[PDB]
């Protein structure tokens, strides 16, 4: 019940580059390399959920100004059209999926708080027993343009070949991230949004509060979590008209001591990095 | 009669990544990009011609020693088995393709000779007129590990969008290199080999000389020149058993001002770089 049982790295590549689509995760599964003896959406959206609009055309009205100016008794109601100049306010038919917030850790240790927060700060659910939320609801790992942060228990973590059982270093393990699904899913380490916490009046300002967890609301859409060559298990052709070339999964051509996904001098087969399948793209 | 007339960059990608195979090169061809109004083996060998041997097993004898040691009257004949320890001397059934040597030029200008050698130092043929040899026979552009050098007239040089007509800088053009064909083809800037220039005797040393050009000899095998998205014109599925993943042509993941192979703000379509056809690999 893992993909690398049935797929070679080249067969896996043949699958993920050309195609839009096709039980406790325990050990003892059939080896990924046939000589050893032992004892779904696959694309990344090319558009975000908030950008689906036509950029050239105005729309509907929103509330632009609650005060004419500074002073006393300046209350007013002014309205504007939603359009390309301000895209944040426009009306939209669909909204991003549910979220249950994960604590954010940094691969740079000095960015992290100096305290043991591994079990203390993690998200969890009760059943009178506490169970860590892992990996949890599907959420993007980090915001676009961020490479050092990762959710505390948000994503799957595989060990490299030869990694020990207990208290291994960061380098030894491989942590998967799901940036690709960020277009329609909330970031795992961020609030889902803000709500209004009161009724305003002349004497009390409008108050807001953060939403740390948000369940299913009508109109939400989301992407599920990706499958990996190493991950658990339980063709659709690429029809796209895209003009410019796709991102494909490839192997770097640069002299190295070993070949990736091949045996080394001592006969040990290894899988260098986690390969998930989201490379081609679709319009949202 | 150019490939980008008939193929989009995306369609070109599908062709070169998935397949092993499928008039003076003047201007005036239909524009690469459809909105403008105007006035073969696609693979790289995974083995090299000199290495086709079984690395674990011996072969046939060669002449190892012509003298016992330092001294006088030391003439003797020794022989050894051709085997893995010395692979240079083994008997081989097939030898690399023909060559006509090109002058070598570096893209680092300070290590180029300080003289005008464009026309004087160029390989050429005569038919009472002297025609430059361009691009010439199919030959590798450079030795593995030297990317800076290119044959003076050896490769096809395409201009970038907007490049002027006369005396443009080296960054206004695109220089293609046939790196992939080196396995079966001699380097364009290197001699084909050495031959004996005399009969050795007790009174004369064995004298050799460089072969600067070579025509077809029985038992040569060679690759033809690659074709490009831009280049002139006038399917086979991949059967490979390779375990590890192939090299593919991929777009870059980094953020940039403009998307590759698209229009900019002024509406000018451009092709950022040349695309060869050779990515998948075969055995030799």
């Amino acid at each position, epitope marked *: 019940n893992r993909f690398h049982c049935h797929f070679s790295p080249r067969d896996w590549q043949r699958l993920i580059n050309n195609n839009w689509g096709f039980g406790s995760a325990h050990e003892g599964c059939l080896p990924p390399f046939p000589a050893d003896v032992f004892m779904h959406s696959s694309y990344a959206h090319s558009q975000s959920l908030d950008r689906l609009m036509n950029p050239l055309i105005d729309q509907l009205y929103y509330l632009s100004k609650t005060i004419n100016g500074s002073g006393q008794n300046q209350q007013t109601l002014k309205f504007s059209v939603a359009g390309p100049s301000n895209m944040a306010v426009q009306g939209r038919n669909y909204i991003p999926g549910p979220s249950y917030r994960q604590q954010r850790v940094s*691969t*740079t240790v000095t960015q992290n708080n100096n305290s043991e927060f591994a079990w203390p700060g993690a998200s969890s659910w009760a059943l009178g027993r506490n169970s860590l939320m892992n990996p949890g609801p599907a959420m993007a790992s980090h915001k676009e343009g961020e*490479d050092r942060f990762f959710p505390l228990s948000g994503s799957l973590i595989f060990g490299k070949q030869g990694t020990g059982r207990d208290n291994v270093d960061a380098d030894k393990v*491989m942590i998967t991230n799901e*940036e690709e699904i960020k277009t329609t899913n909330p970031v795992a380490t961020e609030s889902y949004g803000q709500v209004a916490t009161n009724h305003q009046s002349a004497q009390a300002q409008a108050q807001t509060g953060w939403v740390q967890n948000q369940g299913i609301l009508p109109g939400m859409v989301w992407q599920d979590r990706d499958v990996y060559l190493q991950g658990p298990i339980w063709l659709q052709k690429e029809n796209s008209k895209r003009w410019n070339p796709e991102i494909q999964y490839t192997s770097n051509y640069y002299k190295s001591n070993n070949v990736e996904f091949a045996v080394n001098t001592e006969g040990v087969y290894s899988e260098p990095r986690p*390969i998930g399948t989201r490379y081609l793209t679709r319009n949202l | 009669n150019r490939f980008h007339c008939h193929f989009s960059p995306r369609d070109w990608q599908r062709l070169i990544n998935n397949n092993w195979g499928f008039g003076s090169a003047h201007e005036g061809c239909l524009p690469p990009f459809p909105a403008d109004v105007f006035m073969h083996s696609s693979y790289a060998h995974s083995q090299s011609l000199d290495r086709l041997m079984n690395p674990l097993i011996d072969q046939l004898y060669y002449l190892s020693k012509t003298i016992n040691g330092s001294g006088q009257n030391q003439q003797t004949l020794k022989f050894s088995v051709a085997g893995p320890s010395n692979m240079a001397v083994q008997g081989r059934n097939y030898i690399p393709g023909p060559s006509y040597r090109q002058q070598r030029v570096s893209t680092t200008v300070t290590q180029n000779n300080n003289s005008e050698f464009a026309w004087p130092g160029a390989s050429s043929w005569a038919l009472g007129r002297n025609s430059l040899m361009n691009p010439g026979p199919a030959m590798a552009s450079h030795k593995e590990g*030297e990317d800076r050098f290119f044959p003076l007239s050896g490769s096809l040089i395409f201009g970038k969008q907007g490049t002027g007509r006369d005396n443009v800088d080296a960054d206004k053009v695109m220089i293609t290199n046939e790196e992939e064909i080196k396995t079966t083809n001699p380097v364009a800037t290197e001699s084909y080999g050495q031959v004996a220039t005399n009969h050795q005797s007790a009174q004369a040393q064995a004298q050799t000389g460089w072969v600067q050009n070579q025509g077809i000899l029985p038992g040569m095998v060679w690759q033809d020149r690659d074709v490009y998205l831009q280049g002139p014109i006038w399917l086979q599925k991949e059967n490979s058993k390779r375990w590890n993943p192939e090299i593919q042509y991929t777009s*870059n993941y*980094y953020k*940039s001002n403009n998307v590759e192979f698209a229009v900019n703000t002024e509406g000018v379509y451009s092709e950022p770089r040349p695309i060869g056809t050779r990515y998948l690999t075969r055995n030799l």
Partner: antibody
Amino acid sequence: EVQLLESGGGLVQPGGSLRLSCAASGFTFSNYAMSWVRQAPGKGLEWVSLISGSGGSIDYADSVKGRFTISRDNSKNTLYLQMDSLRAEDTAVYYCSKDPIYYDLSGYYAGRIYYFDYWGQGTLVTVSS
Amino acid sequence: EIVMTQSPATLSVSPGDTATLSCRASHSVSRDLAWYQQKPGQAPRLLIYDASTRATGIPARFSGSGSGTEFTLTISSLQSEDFAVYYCQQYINWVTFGPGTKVDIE
């Protein structure tokens, strides 16, 4: 092969700011993390600042912090360094350097940089009046 | 701010002789280190990384050793091609270099 080449460095008066650039080629620039390192004329080597991959993570040495800003343009395979508010204490040869470890979208930038894999021929910066 | 210490401040040996270079670390750096030679008027070049591994294209006469605080660089069969200052780096916490050791020829 890998080739790191540093552009203009000159003479700047104290408090002046100049910009350095490094043209990298022969390797996929976006994938690796680039670093500036400094050698004062008689002194040994000192690391200055690092930028990784996309440029999301940037760190500086405590000596240069707040004066210096590093940036890269993956589009043009160039690394930049903007020196601001220089002192006479900030004059040495500057080296463009490369991280060995390879970065792709399916993974995270390693927390720290490793040994320096390749080096450019450094450009010199004198700060004096 | 682990402080690195290059044990010989300078050194002089004749060609063909082994030369034992060593540096120390203010705190444990476990098999995270490197060795560079800087010839006069050149940029440094990687010799050894981790504790002992030779960089690609480096002669086999260079060898590293040591873990934790103290490390050693040894040059077998020293030649005249080698005249350089040798540095050691740590890639634990924030990178710091040793002061260097100049190997002088007799």
